[PDB]
Amino acid sequence: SFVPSQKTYQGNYGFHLGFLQSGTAKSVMCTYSPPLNKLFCQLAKTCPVQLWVSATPPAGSRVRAMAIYKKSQHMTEVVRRCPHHERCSDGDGLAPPQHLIRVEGNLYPEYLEDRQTFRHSVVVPYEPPEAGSEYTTIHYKYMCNSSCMGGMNRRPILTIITLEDSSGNLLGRDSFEVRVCACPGRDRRTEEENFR
């Protein structure tokens, strides 16, 4: 499958991502590492992701989330949930069972499959920040740990977030690596130490 672009592009609206500082306590369900530009999260737990812009994009703007494998040998393979998780009864009535990335806390998600590449993505309308806020938050959930294919260790993934207009045209792009794991706080500390 043709590999989607992962090139960061702030664009005309200075679009980029942000993440709350969550620390590395073993109780943390989701934590982001700036040095690794990597999100560590527990299976099916909500992950707040921040959207920042220098100016509000036009009406009808949309935000798409798509996962792609990080290893070159895996890049052309569509990221899907493991057969077991897909068969698991955890559906919310909105997301097809095969989708790895889901949105929580948004009334308007659209779960899509590209007719050519077969890649999945989930899109929600872009909304400006709430009063007193400089960013907008979208809550994502990763519904599979890829345990059936060697886990995140063998099958690391990246999430590509794109700001788009109502017709699907690119307005901005950013991305981050994601590791679904048992103890996010522990994994981050270990990987950051290893990085050093």
Side-chain angles (χ1 to χ4, degrees):
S1 174
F2 180 73
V3 185
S5 179
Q6 71 180 66
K7 186 68 172 178
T8 301
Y9 176 61
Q10 299 197 326
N12 298 142
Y13 300 98
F15 177 76
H16 65 277
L17 304 172
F19 301 82
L20 290 171
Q21 198 159 50
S22 293
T24 54
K26 294 184 177 181
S27 185
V28 179
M29 295 175 258
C30 60
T31 186
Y32 175 77
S33 169
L36 303 172
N37 182 34
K38 184 167 184 173
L39 177 70
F40 297 79
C41 60
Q42 286 183 158
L43 182 60
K45 290 304 181 181
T46 52
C47 302
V49 173
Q50 300 176 172
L51 307 181
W52 293 73
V53 291
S54 293
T56 297
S61 288
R62 293 151 67 75
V63 185
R64 184 191 308 272
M66 174 179 293
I68 64 168
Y69 287 117
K70 183 181 179 181
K71 291 182 177 175
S72 63
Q73 56 191 268
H74 304 324
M75 295 193 81
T76 56
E77 191 163 359
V78 175
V79 177
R80 318 166 178 290
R81 306 176 75 195
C82 280
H84 183 296
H85 296 304
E86 171 182 353
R87 190 182 311 178
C88 186
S89 296
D90 57 13
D92 50 26
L94 311 182
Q98 307 67 40
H99 285 237
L100 182 286
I101 304 178
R102 289 186 190 176
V103 163
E104 186 61 66
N106 195 104
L107 298 171
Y108 325 91
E110 295 174 30
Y111 288 89
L112 310 162
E113 179 195 58
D114 189 279
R115 61 161 294 285
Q116 304 174 58
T117 69
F118 297 114
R119 291 179 185 279
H120 310 326
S121 65
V122 54
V123 179
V124 292
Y126 168 79
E127 299 173 0
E130 295 69 13
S133 188
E134 299 170 293
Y135 60 82
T136 67
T137 296
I138 291 175
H139 301 275
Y140 291 112
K141 295 184 300 181
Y142 293 82
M143 307 304 296
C144 182
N145 52 22
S146 301
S147 62
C148 69
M149 59 186 96
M152 304 289 86
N153 277 171
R154 178 163 186 171
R155 287 270 176 173
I157 63 170
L158 307 176
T159 292
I160 302 174
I161 306 299
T162 47
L163 179 66
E164 307 175 357
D165 66 12
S166 68
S167 306
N169 296 302
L170 177 73
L171 291 184
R173 188 188 300 105
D174 202 344
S175 59
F176 53 99
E177 178 170 354
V178 180
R179 179 188 179 73
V180 176
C181 51
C183 191
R186 185 180 63 197
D187 284 30
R188 176 179 167 194
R189 278 174 292 173
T190 295
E191 297 202 8
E192 297 189 323
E193 292 179 57
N194 182 60
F195 183 65
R196 305 173 183 177

